[PDB]
Amino acid sequence: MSFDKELALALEIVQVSCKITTSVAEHTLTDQTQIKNDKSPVTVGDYSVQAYVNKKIHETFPEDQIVAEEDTKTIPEDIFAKVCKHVQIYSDMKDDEIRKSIDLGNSTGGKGRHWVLDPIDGTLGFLRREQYAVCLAFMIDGDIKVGVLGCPNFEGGLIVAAQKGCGAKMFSVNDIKNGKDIHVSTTPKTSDMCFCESVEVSHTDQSRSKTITERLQVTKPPVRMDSQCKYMAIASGRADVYLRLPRNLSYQEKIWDHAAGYLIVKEAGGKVTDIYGNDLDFSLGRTLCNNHGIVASNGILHEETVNVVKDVLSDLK
Ligand SMILES: Nc1ncnc2c1ncn2[C@@H]1O[C@H](COP(=O)(O)O)[C@@H](O)[C@H]1O
Ligand SMILES: [Mg+2]
Numbered sequence: 001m002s003f004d005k006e007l008a009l010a011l012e013i014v015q016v017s018c019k020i021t022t023s024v025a026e027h028t029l030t031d032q033t034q035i036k037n038d039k040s041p042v043t044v045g046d047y048s049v050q051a052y053v054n055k056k057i058h059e060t061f062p063e064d065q066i067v068a069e070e071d072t073k074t075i076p077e078d079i080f081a082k083v084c085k086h087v088q089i090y091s092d093m094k095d096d097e098i099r100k101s102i103d104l105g106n107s108t109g110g111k112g113r114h115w116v117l118d119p120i121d122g123t124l125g126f127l128r129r130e131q132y133a134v135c136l137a138f139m140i141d142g143d144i145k146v147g148v149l150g151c152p153n154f155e156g157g158l159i160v161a162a163q164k165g166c167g168a169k170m171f172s173v174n175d176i177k178n179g180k181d182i183h184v185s186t187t188p189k190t191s192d193m194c195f196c197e198s199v200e201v202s203h204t205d206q207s208r209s210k211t212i213t214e215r216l217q218v219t220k221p222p223v224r225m226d227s228q229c230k231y232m233a234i235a236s237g238r239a240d241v242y243l244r245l246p247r248n249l250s251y252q253e254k255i256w257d258h259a260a261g262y263l264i265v266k267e268a269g270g271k272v273t274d275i276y277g278n279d280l281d282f283s284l285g286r287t288l289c290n291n292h293g294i295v296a297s298n299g300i301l302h303e304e305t306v307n308v309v310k311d312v313l314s315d316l317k
């Protein structure tokens with residue numbers, strides 16, 4: 001009823017993944033960047049991490065399906081070229097296996113055993129040379145069992161990991177053998193809360209979080225940061241609350257944006273719901289289709305915050 005094996009695999013490959021991303025970042029970023037048709041960026045690093053991880057997962061657990069962000073549908077010839085080369089540093093795949101590996105990420109989730117991957121979470125914070133994450137989780141019937149977040153730029157480079165029921169833990173990117181426990185903060189007044197949110201204005205409503213926090217009488221200004229590294233701040237007590245605020249009722253959050261962090265905050269003693277206080281349902285596919293937005297906190301302040309968020313956002317459509 002424990003998942004030691006799934007968890008040892010994830011720490012192993014998230015840690016290499018981090019080596020892969022730091023080394024991709026050693027070069028100029030432009031000639032390594034693609035603009036998806038939807039306008040979002042994706043880099044040589046995303047494809048390299050996802051090729052390596054799907055390969056390692058598929059070798060070790062031949063029956064599990066993978067849900068991951070990227071695919072090869074369209075991926076320019078010269079980017080692919082560089083992926084290939086970054087990949088062969090860590091495994092012997094020919095350009096063939098690499099494409100096949102990246103394309104294993106097409107599972108629709110739901111029943112059974114699924115791995116959930118963000119090869120680079122917050123790709124923009126990666127071009128920004130600021131916060132970003134390799135995000136891996138393992139679930140069964142939409143219940144998260146293992147979550148790993150590797151964050152090469154946060155406070156020196158840190159890896160946090162949790163399996164269900166067994167607590168939360170922090171590692172250096174350099175040593176995944178020696179970890180420490182990790183518990184959310186004990187902050188009991190919302191006026192003393194440090195709150196966090198995305199840097200991008202398209203990913204969260206920063207005008208309304210201002211309103212919410214001003215009502216909660218928050219003194220300090222938001223720390224704006226990219227990626228699931230926001231869940232990792234909640235979990236280690238560096239931040240108090242984390243808001244992700246929608247502008248409509250039609251955006252559905254991707255499960256590779258939330259699943260690893262979700263379990264890590266809960267194991268470290270906090271609470272994660274949506275903006276109406278409902279628990280996240282990871283069993284309805286590739287997105288959290290029965291949820292609207294995110295509230296992640298240290299548990300102490302959750303309902304107090306949710307009440308004010310419900311209200312500032314009762315007009316979504
Ligand atoms: N309209 C949107 N609302 C919320 N999240 C989004 C939206 N569009 C894209 N995203 C996701 O936000 C993630 C990055 O969030 P962040 O790093 O917090 O800015 C990406 O992985 C996107 O999938
Ligand atoms: Mg990404």
Ligand code: NA
Nearest residue numbers: 118120121122
């Ligand atoms: Na992402």
